[model samples]
Target: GHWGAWMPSTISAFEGTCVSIPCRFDFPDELRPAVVHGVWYFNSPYPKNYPPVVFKSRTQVVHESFQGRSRLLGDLGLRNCTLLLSTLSPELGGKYYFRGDLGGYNQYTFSEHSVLDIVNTPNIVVPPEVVAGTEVEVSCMVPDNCPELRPELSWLGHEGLGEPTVLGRLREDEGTWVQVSLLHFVPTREANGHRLGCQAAFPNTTLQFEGYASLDVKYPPVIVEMNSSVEAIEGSHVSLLCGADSNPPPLLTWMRDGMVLREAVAKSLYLDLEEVTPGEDGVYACLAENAYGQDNRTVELSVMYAPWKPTVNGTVVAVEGETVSILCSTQSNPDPILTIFKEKQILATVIYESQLQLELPAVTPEDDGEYWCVAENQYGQRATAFNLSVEFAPIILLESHCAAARDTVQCLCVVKSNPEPSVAFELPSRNVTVNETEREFVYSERSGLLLTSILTIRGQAQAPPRVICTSRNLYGTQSLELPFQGA
Candidate 1:
């Protein structure tokens, strides 16, 4: 009698996980040399007389229940037959048998028995529920059963609709178990009834095991708040902060007036701002949203003013041939471009600081008129002027002294002029006198006395006449005078 020794074996798996069975055979030399047929059978309720069904046979027959999901692994020639089953359903867990048949097939057959225990489907674990306007994540894991099955994971939502919005399948948390899948997204009421499902598929079977969990994402997103100086200077830079807190990091975005500031096409929260202009000042709002819901906040930005306008300041009186400093001042965000202009003509442009120095070889009248300092930035523009004036002691162009002790004293004087000379007179008695002088002047294109003054005076005593002349140009002024003693 050729008897087969049964090797005790056990197979275990979670109801929704894949499983495999391995078998090795050894027989007496004489029986081993003979061709033997191999067959695998399973009985869910353990029938007393015959196994419930022959699940797999070397002759290529598989029971209806195990048709698509059962297959043989290893070489049947070496009598080392292994069975692989996937998408394990609890109904498939039971005592199973492997039988070897000799040459004639039907006449001689030996069997070995094995038991399989399938547990209830495992739970799908994930982060706690996320509140409105917040983000959350969930993870699905599988237990260690048939390490050789090397299963793959997939996620199904709702009614096994299209692919999941998010999918993750990698080992994490020190690799204790394979993370079948991870789901990440903002929670929303629409997702309340949504189920997060996980599936494990074995290497060579069409069957797959699946588990699911309903998500109640709970953490709420912190409302985004904004901050800015209530009053901002025109032409100056300003910044507004949009911030929020949530389980999942929050996104910040900016808005101005009634228009939505776009950080993304969806209008999700985002941080945004640049060279702030007067138009940018308004009721700014920040909108934050997660799966939970949406949150928003608004802030007022006021753009303000005199020191507000650009100005050029300096001493009106400057010594001849001395450097004069002109300071151009203004305030602006992004730093305003400061420029100095004299007599409606631009002198210098694009100065960072407000100060500009213009050297005056000598003070002149041409440099006297309205000087403009212009300040500009993306925000706004401003301008103010500084009037300049130069002064020196009057020169005496002509002076003559006479003594006669008469009724009314008078003196006459004529001075060749630069700014044309003005004539005045003084008497020997230490008294000053004024004269109305009359003179004729000719005009020429080049340099010629343009105007002549005539001064007439009448008096009994002769007095000295003093005349002063002054001249001016872009540099400044000069005076000349001549003095004479009369007897």
Candidate 2:
């Protein structure tokens, strides 16, 4: 048999790494001896003196690019043509064929050529646990080979990523060598949901390879989404929600009026007010806590209701000539409409009022009665009553006068007061009244405060020169002189 060989048809290599070619060769005779030299050629096969030799054994010469990087691990005389190449580069990837020489005893060139495929990417290994605000360590695995041709690495995608430097020894358990880079950083919640970059650049070449790892940043619970204030009508349902930025999930609870509500703890960020009332209007807070830290948010809850009973001045009293003010107010959620009325007529009205006053600059005798105030709102209505009483002197009209006759003097008086005031006739140095023939008094409108009194006074001598009209009451007394006229 002629010279025979076994070699692979295809092989793969990574840039800045090493590759080993497995081969075996046999001579026609069974008595095999060590060959003098083994030659590995690139791109051309079975050539004469013009064959390009990438590696030549026994002479220890190689091409300029593969000078010290190529080595022969098997001797052709022992029927082995295995080759080892270190620091495989872009230009070294091509069809390769081997040649063996037994120093003129035998010479053979392999017919089968192995195609080398150079991959430009490095396997990037990321740390399993990459929490925010902590130190991170990662590695870029390169095919084990020469140290001078190691690839440069870069850490990217965040301002906190520290400088990336290649350092660490080789690992024998793994086929590839590891270049670890420590990234020292402390990231906040703002850096969550981003990406971390690992880029590898080939030495002295424009080619680059990169891989990305999603950054899952962890932090304490922070109130991010919530409304500061909320409002709802009484007897209605209201729901609230809050959002936080945290890595591990958090438990949320609701607080109201400076106290924790019953059964308000929620796994999700939600709370509800099924029933609302005027007494339930107060501050509400949403709290979130985790192992890292805690945070809370507050919302002012406004509960609306209808108006309550109206409040006003009770039993107000004033003089006939004195000023009086009647104030009425009520309580409600939003605003209450207040009105003051008397005798089925509205005197003063106010809408959405805190308090309203109906002022009377001057009091009148007819103004003494029960006053009413009605307060109303969207929910309900209420009305209350306020009384007013006016006290004054009597004999306040101009109709009172005196007429003199030949034997009698008559006087007419008109008096008005809150309570009936006693009216009488005053004479000049005489008894006030008595003796039906001597003096007589007549009164009209006996049912109410207004009174008309007439008196007749006679003298045995001449008629009394002057007569005076007098009235008396609880406030004070009043006396007016009547102009005398002859009959």
Candidate 3:
């Protein structure tokens, strides 16, 4: 047998591109000395020379379609039969065989042939912007003329892209056919940023080409919920972030209590309160807008601050048996819990608001003490003290009397009342004024629970000889009459 030619069983190539088919041949030892020529043919049977020879030596004929497109890259004398095919199309795929001619002695074609599998590189055309919910079409075109070897089209990556339609048309200038595969579907916001690929594949072969395009589905601005609770301690750092999806990037703004904040015009806003107060608590809003539409969301800011010292309102002093309401008021964020305390015991506690009341239906001696209003929250606490003094009318003892000794009259008055009673002596005659020569006063209890008073006065012999002792306190007053006698 002549030196058999060896080549790849199949060669894969892409359309609109170049490929090299590696071929090597050997001559029989008997014909080794003879000068030989080489020729290449496509889809042609052996023995009978066929038309449309793809490649030939300088002395041989070449096909018009493959005139400069195909050439021998290997030396004929060395029996290297490699061929380079440039500007290939899908129609160029076929069985290729090498023919060797020995001048006047013999001519033969190789039994084993090389199979060329030219695949078209898919060309994809996608609109720059696809409107959401609207039916849109994307086309992948492949330059292929062979109807029998129709390239199949399919989509990859995203599901439900819909079936593809294959259509073909002949180019009048090149007299060759081109196949286009189109995918029709409705785009949605979910498809945004997702890749959609068009793949062209030949049936029963390993030839395929894929083209990709990222979907840019444009729609109205969608606000991504930022479900963060805007709760912070006084003098702490805080931040808020707003996010949305849109075709053109959405403009973002931050608002406070229905007023737009120019300094917070951004997707993220930072708050650094040097000293947060109750005045800083309010509603904060985030707005997002684009050409299509706008969206917004809001969050309430609760600045947790320590309770301020409470102020006590109403009467601190009340008469016995009289109703009194002592109100305690304070300022705090989140409305600090207010509590009324009397002698280390909690009298009442108020939450949900800052005001607290210590209502005394009937005032008594027991209610005469120091009371405290305590305001507290998570941050800190404070308190204020109130002194309540309950008073009653002064009670004078009937044992009080007056006696005369050596031109002087001695008078004594004993009285008991809250807030101690003030005692004084009054003369009966308008012309004679009472002169107290000696006076003594004493309290039974530390806080004036009981009081005593003594007075000595000089009397004139012709005077009315009568005097009065008066006791006064917060509740009421009482008096005792004493008659003066000459000693």
Q: Give lDDT tens digits, candidate 2, residues 1-78.
A: 566777777666466466767777766775455546778888788676465577876576667777788887755566
Alpha carbon lDDT of each predicted model: 0.54, 0.70, 0.70
Q: Which pairs clash inside model 3? A: none
Q: Which model scores highest in lDDT?
A: 3
Locate the minimum summed-lDDT window of 10 residues in model 2.
169-178
User: Per-residue alpha-carbon lDDT of model 1 for 128-184, expressed as tens digits?
Assistant: 545545666666665554656555666666353333443333433332233355556
lDDT of 3 by residue, 56-75 (tens): 67754577767778777657
Of the two candidates 1 and 3, the one with more favorable TM-score, higher being better, is 3
Work out the TM-score per prediction.
0.33, 0.48, 0.55
Q: Looking at model 3, which ten-residue stretch has the lowest summed lDDT?
A: 437-446
Off by over 4 Å in 2: 1-131, 143-160, 172-179, 201-208, 221-254, 258-291, 297-310, 313-387, 390-399, 404-410, 421-443, 446-448, 455-483
Considering only N, C-alpha and C atoms within 3 Å, which residue pairs clash in candidate 2? 35-77
Better of 1 and 2 by TM-score: 2
Please report, as a residue range, the 10-residue window in candidate 1 with the lowest summed lDDT: 438-447
Better of 2 and 3 by TM-score: 3
Candidate 2 CA-lDDT value = 0.70
Best to worst by TM-score, what's the order?
A: 3, 2, 1
